[model samples]
Target chain A: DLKLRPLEREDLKFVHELNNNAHIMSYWFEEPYEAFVELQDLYDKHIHDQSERRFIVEKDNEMVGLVELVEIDYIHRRTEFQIIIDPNYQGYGYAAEATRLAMDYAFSVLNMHKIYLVVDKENEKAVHVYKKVGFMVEGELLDEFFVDGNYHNAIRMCMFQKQYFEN
Target chain B: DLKLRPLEREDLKFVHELNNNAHIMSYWFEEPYEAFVELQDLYDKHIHDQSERRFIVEKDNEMVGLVELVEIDYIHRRTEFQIIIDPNYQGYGYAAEATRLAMDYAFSVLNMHKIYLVVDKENEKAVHVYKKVGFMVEGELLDEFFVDGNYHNAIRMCMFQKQYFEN
Candidate 1:
């Protein structure tokens, strides 16, 4: 069974490793991360923030992935999401399960109207999973930014609470 | 208060013009759309398939939006939803009101376990409104490909009928 819980400091190291995995980190970030310390500092601020946070993907007792409500815009009534799964945990469907749980929090507990996500152009496997789990294609921004000396498009998608509830 | 009566042949021109509006098309099927004649042809096929197509958006005898529960996969107990609202008639909660009506039909008449839609990333306004009614963003495609030579990210979103009725 996969379970998601509040992301604690001890979990930072696991997240760091997941973020550093070249294959997993490629689209999520510009490149592989080299520091757990900085990420811990960032997450320390993150956990204390008003937004909900959790690390719900685990196979039995071993940690397999991390998912969170990263940036929340309350005035706009929206939240942005991010999920990272370790290289070893790639194909277990944990990401979708974790996402389903996170959305339950966003829709019911937080009473938020919308949840959104951004994906890098090259990450196709993630795109497939996100579709399978339920999310709507909202819009696109072209020539988003120059990353790794190449222009990349950052695609943003949103699911309203109504869309979320049906699933 | 919408009454989802059967669509008629004469509704083609109105539906065509409403859907062809660039603003409306941006959220869905963002291509040069069908003319009245072409739209009638499509509607002919659509109604013959026993889709729950509705046109009246308000009890005031005003026409604002069109909704249909189409492309159902019976084995999955799921169906796809698509809505078209006239650009001039928007911003007054008609979509939300009409969506509630359509959703009722989906839950009551169709008895579908799930109903969902695909949305574009930029249509944040639609995303927000849809959320107010209930929907979740389940997935996203990074650079789905091109439409009108423009890069588009397709977002897939869904809601389960069971959860909708439960809420």
Candidate 2:
């Protein structure tokens, strides 16, 4: 189900459709991406940034979602996970499918032993998807984000392969 | 495949079931219990003593395994485990289950900070099981026991609760 491929600069239009989907950024990320050109600029930068790698989640070779691993930590074998899907692709199991492929690539190919993510506290649907994909709720930090002139806490989820398989 | 409980006087018929089949103790008291009454008497003497407690692993009301935790006092909170299942029951995941139950009782009721077990250096199957049960190799007690006129080195494997004190 994970049909992700290398994201090219040509895929900027699809990325715009992803983050700009109504209700996608409602509780967390703001509307800084009001125009398509800014989304294209992000796509260009991500391609050249060696530390940040991006991939397009494809269905029948058509871009429908985004997945990436950013801020690699080599010494600790840990990394950050990011994913986004257009609202029209919502009911499908694509998010969960992409998680398995992305994490396998992160840990097996990249030699990472741990992977983690941070979700906005009020984004309950995203939180549900994360648990179904096998991450544990480690803890929460208060007022950790500043969005639209107000602060919000973030729910932390994490998984370590050693303890993950033991239980 | 796991049904373990605190050792009972009624379950003594399985003592020979454990001792006669223990590969690690092949030469130690390989007596078969032909009568249940003698086994019950043996249990009243050794298993019910203050320092040692044994447990039964029953399935279909039939005892299938034996395990014990011996109390110690040199350290503030540590105990030792000795377990052996019926040879017929090997490879059935019973040892791990019994080890887990014993640990729960030790940590919760006895407030143990550390739990460990001693095994002969040549018992490879046991060494693997101990590590699988979360006990790290702590130290090797050199030539600690004299059995059959031969000195055998014993290895100490251990696990610590987060509360272990170093200061």
Candidate 3:
């Protein structure tokens, strides 16, 4: 069974590994390498911030991925979604399940009106998953991210609370 | 007769008035009221921030509006555009001309790859002005902003460097 729990200080090491992976960070459109100390400091700094929530995806009590709702705007009732699955646990459909759980948390628990995500347009696998989970394409942004020596296009996808609850 | 000039300390009084106007702030998806002192403090804090550029829209030596290129991401070569024309000077074609000037500054001067803006979908006049200046609709965001006792939909529009130069 797949589950999600709040990310704690103890989870920093796992997060550090992901942060330093070029393949993953490129998709996230963030710098590829982060020091463990920096990660810890960031966690400490944002511990009380209401604009973000990080969760560890667990499968049968073993950590498998990370899911986050960042840029949570209470005034607009929207949030941005992010996810990363550990390389070791890639083929088990953890990403889809984790995404569903995150969407539920966003709409039902957090009462967000919308949840949106940006993904590299060329990443067909992830795009397929998002579409399968009921996200509609909001737009395509050209040259939105610089990764691996070239700028890449991105697609912005969104799921509204009404649509989520309809299904 | 429209000109674009960098926003200076002397312009905060004008900015304060725009920020406090309910009709204008509603379309911008921001609170309609702010103290003058808070505006001054924000200007001070962000004076040296490379991520933002604020410009005053001038028409024949008179301040007509505000234009801003905010959330400037150097790595991605993108920025978000914001503009607010003074209520007293609403009927002229100043908004379109000012937007063209801002686009030239963004694509040529700043070397940005893309510039995007968000507008309330119901604001057809503003949307028409943006389209006239070469902005293409990216997507519609459902219930993206909460203002004036209701949720408001927004449209995301963008202009690309290549497209700007081609025209």
Candidate 4:
């Protein structure tokens, strides 16, 4: 079974590993982090409050990865969503399940109208999971990320409350 | 004969009046302010330094309306843009010329990758002007706005720098 909880002090190592995984970072602007503390600081600062949220994905009690609901705009009733599955836990549908849970909170609990995300157009695996979790590509931002010498496009995906219940 | 300039202290009344216009406020969330200080406080907090901007739309050195490039995201190199033409100055192609100038600044001066904006799907007049100005509808956010007991859709339009210069 898949579940999510707030990050804990004991999960630092797993979080560090996820930060440095080459595949997890393939589409990122920079190569994997070279140090642990640099990322640990960011991890320690993870806050789950009204303005935003961060969660740790767990599969059968094993910490798998992280998910976030950031840049929440109350007036607009929308927020930005993100998920990163640890390479070791890849391909088990944990990310999709976690995404579904996050969308539920966003729609029902937070009463948000839409939850949007930015995903690399070329990241087929990630794209597949997001779509399976009920996201529709609203648009493509052309040449948004300059990752390795060439620019890349990012798909703007959104899941409205109506669509969430339908799917 | 059209330009965008910084809002001056002397120009606050015109801006206030435009913000209070019946047609303009129809789509907005609230009524026009009763005093200038109410809006000036908003104006002071409106400056987001480098990340956002507010400018007065001028035709023949006379203030006509407002336009802004806001919610600028540095990492993504994109910004949200908007414009409002006073009812008196409507249908004079001022909005188009001002949009062209604002885009030039956003792409050339700011080195932004793309610019996007939102418009109500049912606002036919505004939609027509945005399309005429070369912004393409990227997608529609379903029922994103609530007014008069009904939810309304908004069209997300975007213009890339490459497309801007091409047109």
Q: What's the TM for model 3?
A: 0.89
Error of 3 at B23 (Å): 4.4
Candidate closer to the true structure by lDDT (higher is better), 1 or 4: 4
Residue range A77-159, candidate 3, lDDT tens digits: 99999998988877788889999999999999999999999999989999999999999888787677887889888998999
Candidate 4's TM-score? 0.77
The global Cα lDDT (0 to 1) of model 1 is: 0.65
**Per-candidate TM-score against the hidden true structure:** 0.46, 0.44, 0.89, 0.77
Assess each prediction's global lDDT (C-alpha) against the native: 0.65, 0.71, 0.83, 0.74
Q: Candidate 3: which stretches are off by over 4 Å?
A: A22-33, B22-33
> lDDT by residue for model 1 over A4-31, one digit each (tens)?
7777778776766666664332221111
Evaluate residue B101 in candidate 1 and report its C-alpha lDDT on the 0 to 100 scale: 81
Which CAPRI level is candidate 2?
Answer: incorrect
Candidate 4, A1-167: lDDT as tens digits: 78879777677677667766643332111122346665555444543335567678887788888877877767668888878787666667787888888988889888998888988889887778888777887777666676666779888888888777776
TM-score of chain A for the candidates in order shown: 0.83, 0.81, 0.92, 0.82
Model 4 regions lying over 4 Å from their true place:
A7-49, A59-62, B8-16, B22-48
For model 2, residues B1-167, the per-residue Cα lDDT tens digits are: 56667776655556755664454342212233444565665555564244555678677787878777776432245678777778787777888878877777766665566888888898887889878877789899989988667999989999876633321
